[PDB]
Structures are given as structure tokens and as C-alpha cells.
Design an enzyme around this catalytic site. Structure first.
Site, PDB file in Angstrom:
ATOM      1  N   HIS A 162       0.848  -1.232   0.000  1.00 30.52           N
ATOM      2  CA  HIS A 162       0.000   0.000   0.000  1.00 30.52           C
ATOM      3  C   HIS A 162       0.859   1.248   0.000  1.00 30.52           C
ATOM      4  O   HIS A 162       0.490   2.181  -0.661  1.00 30.52           O
ATOM      5  CB  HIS A 162      -1.020   0.116   1.235  1.00 30.52           C
ATOM      6  CG  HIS A 162      -0.537   0.066   2.687  1.00 30.52           C
ATOM      7  ND1 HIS A 162      -0.579  -0.988   3.425  1.00 30.52           N
ATOM      8  CD2 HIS A 162       0.026   1.041   3.507  1.00 30.52           C
ATOM      9  CE1 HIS A 162      -0.096  -0.722   4.595  1.00 30.52           C
ATOM     10  NE2 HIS A 162       0.272   0.533   4.697  1.00 30.52           N
ATOM     11  N   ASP A 212      -0.374  -7.866   1.108  1.00 30.17           N
ATOM     12  CA  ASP A 212       0.221  -6.488   1.281  1.00 30.17           C
ATOM     13  C   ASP A 212       1.736  -6.621   1.521  1.00 30.17           C
ATOM     14  O   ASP A 212       2.182  -6.617   2.665  1.00 30.17           O
ATOM     15  CB  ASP A 212      -0.407  -5.721   2.534  1.00 30.17           C
ATOM     16  CG  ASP A 212       0.027  -4.247   2.652  1.00 30.17           C
ATOM     17  OD1 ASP A 212       0.738  -3.736   1.790  1.00 30.17           O
ATOM     18  OD2 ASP A 212      -0.406  -3.693   3.653  1.00 30.17           O
ATOM     19  N   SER A 250       3.581   1.792   9.171  1.00 32.97           N
ATOM     20  CA  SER A 250       3.150   0.851   8.090  1.00 32.97           C
ATOM     21  C   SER A 250       4.347   0.487   7.226  1.00 32.97           C
ATOM     22  O   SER A 250       5.151   1.363   6.979  1.00 32.97           O
ATOM     23  CB  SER A 250       2.105   1.542   7.234  1.00 32.97           C
ATOM     24  OG  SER A 250       0.927   0.833   7.578  1.00 32.97           O
ATOM     25  N   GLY A 251       4.474  -0.745   6.808  1.00 31.96           N
ATOM     26  CA  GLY A 251       5.660  -1.095   5.947  1.00 31.96           C
ATOM     27  C   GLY A 251       6.812  -1.511   6.828  1.00 31.96           C
ATOM     28  O   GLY A 251       7.583  -2.361   6.443  1.00 31.96           O
TER      29      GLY A 251
END
Lengths: 241, 52
Positions: free
Chosen positions: A42, A88, A185-186
Site C-alpha cells: 500500500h 500487502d 506501516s511497511g
């Protein structure tokens, strides 16, 4: 990260930060080798132009080390559905290799089965990141770490408002307010086995940061291990499996 | 066996041909005793960069 601690020099060296067009960071990543970084697919959509930065522990400062690399080729899982954040994962291939050094080392990739039986059955994993810090940790651009216990799929599937496919896994406290938040995130979710750290997840999403009753969910790296591996050998775009 | 204490390997354990064979991540060599893993270069994988 909400209420964790900071990373001492040396402590979280496989952390990568992704910066966007205005050198503001939006997602994080894990360093796997001198050429590859892992992040959450994402993130590809939170900026239009981005670079990867390593060896940094204070978003608004340069201490030394701090390298910026450009991307050359990026593999995004071609089964990534923007609506589910299922599959993801994306790996980035940089153009210039990383000079591992103080505060810049890779995280290890375990081997599927072993991962399943040992890391994933540990009691906790640790996550890190430079995003949203809602607690009591003076300054706002430091790198933090937080230890999140693993949750069991039943209690995960029964808390989340959305689906948990077999590529997601949940981790976090149920009432305590420490968690992965926006800007992590990530970023890496790593499990420690005898003084060595292997990556077990990629921060994916949550329903608010530290909301009581909700946990954060991460990508199941163990379900992408062979994918990652091939991805680290090719230099193409999405691919599957 | 593996389970027991993971072989007593520092990292991966496998059972094959009636024995326990341990292995290491990329960046490490299996050591003499057959359980430990030795770095190969200054910066292994999954080790805090403590010192330098």
C-alpha cells in the site's frame, strides 16, 4: 508507534524509512540485503515519488550514516487488493547498494517451516517505526520499538471488523495502549530467537492506533517467504505466488 | 530432537536421515560442533550493530 521505547544505536539496524517528494517519511521498511528492502505494498500509494533512507534515528536531524538510496525496480504482489490489504507486500530493489554499518544491518529471513514452529510460536515479536507517537516519549521524530505479543487467529478474526485472510496475523495488547500507528506501516515486525532477529511480519493496518479491543495486523511474511526469495532474484514488476 | 531445545542449534533445525542437521541464515557458516553459526563478515543479519 504508541508507547514503546526508542532504539539505542545499534539496536534496530534493519529499519528503513521511505520518504516522499517533500522528504517527509510516510512508511517504513526492513533491509534484507544490500540491494533489497521490504515494505507494505500500500505504501506505493501514499506518495508519488519516494526514496529509501537508512541509518537515521531522528526524522528531523542527520547524525551521520543517514544514506538515501533511489529505487531501481519494485515488485508489488500482483494479488494486492487495495480494498482488503490482502497480499500487502512489495520488495524494492535499489540502484546503489547499502554499505551496512553502525546502525544499518539486515534482518534475517527464516526458512518457512522452522519459522512456523519456532518464531511464530514465540510469545512476542517486536515492531519498530518513526510514525505517530501518542504517549510520553519527548520529541516526535525518534525511532521507536515496541514489543507486541502474538494473538491467536480466533481472537483476531473475532475482533477485527474486516477480514483476516491467512496472510495476516495480529499482534498487540488488548487494553494496554501501545501499538503500531500511522507512519509505521511497511515497517518491520521481527522475532528474536537466540540473540538473532528474523522478520516475521510487515506492519499492514489497524483500526486506529491503540484502540482497546483492537490489535494491529501484519502481513504473514512466512506466507510470502518463497515469493520474497524469487523477488530478490528477479528485477521485474508484480509477479505472484 | 529439534522441538526439545530446537536441536540446540543457534538457528534452523531439520531432522533428516535419522539425524538433526542445523543450518544458519545467509551470512553465517555452521560451526565445528554442528550447532553454532559463525558470521562471515562484519555485519551479519539479525544482530544489533553493537560496537563500530
Amino acid at each position: 508507534i504508541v508507547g514503546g521505547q526508542e532504539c539505542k544505536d545499534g539496536e534496530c539496524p534493519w529499519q528503513a524509512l521511505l520518504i516522499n517528494e517533500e522528504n517527509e517519511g510516510f512508511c517504513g521498511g526492513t533491509i534484507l540485503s544490500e540491494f533489497y528492502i521490504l515494505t507494505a505494498a500500500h505504501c506505493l500509494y501514499q506518495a508519488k515519488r519516494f526514496k529509501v533512507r537508512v541509518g537515521d534515528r531522528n526524522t528531523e536531524q542527520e547524525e551521520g550514516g543517514e544514506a538515501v538510496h533511489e529505487v531501481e525496480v519494485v515488485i508489488k504482489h500482483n494479488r494486492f487488493t487495495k480494498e482488503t490489504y490482502d497480499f500487502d507486500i512489495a520488495v524494492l530493489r535499489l540502484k546503489t547498494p547499502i554499505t551496512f554499518r553502525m546502525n544499518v544491518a539486515p534482518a534475517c529471513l527464516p526458512e518457512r517451516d522452522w519459522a512456523e514452529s519456532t518464531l511464530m510460536t514465540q510469545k512476542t515479536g517486536i515492531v519498530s517505526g518513526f510514525g505517530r507517537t501518542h504517549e510520553k516519549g519527548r520529541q516526535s521524530t525518534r525511532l521507536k520499538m515496541l514489543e507486541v505479543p502474538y494473538v491467536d487467529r480466533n481472537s483476531c478474526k473475532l475482533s477485527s471488523s474486516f477480514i483476516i485472510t491467512q496472510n495476516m496475523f495480529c499482534a498487540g495488547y488488548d487494553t494496554k495502549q501501545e501499538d503500531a500507528c500511522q507512519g509505521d506501516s511497511g515497517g518491520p515486525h521481527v522475532t528474536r530467537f537466540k540473540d538473532t532477529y528474523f522478520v516475521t511480519g510487515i506492519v499492514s493496518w489497524g483500526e486506529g492506533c491503540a484502540r482497546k479491543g483492537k490489535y494491529g495486523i501484519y502481513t504473514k511474511v512466512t506466507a510470502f517467504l518463497k515469493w520474497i526469495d524469487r523477488s530478490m532474484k528477479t528485477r521485474g514488476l508484480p509477479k505472484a505466488k | 530432537l529439534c522441538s526439545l531445545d530446537n536441536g540446540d542449534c543457534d538457528q534452523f533445525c531439520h531432522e533428516e536421515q535419522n539425524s538433526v542437521v542445523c543450518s544458519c541464515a545467509r551470512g553465517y557458516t555452521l560451526a565445528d560442533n554442528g550447532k553454532a553459526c559463525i558470521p562471515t563478515g562484519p555485519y551479519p543479519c539479525g544482530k544489533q550493530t553493537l560496537e563500530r
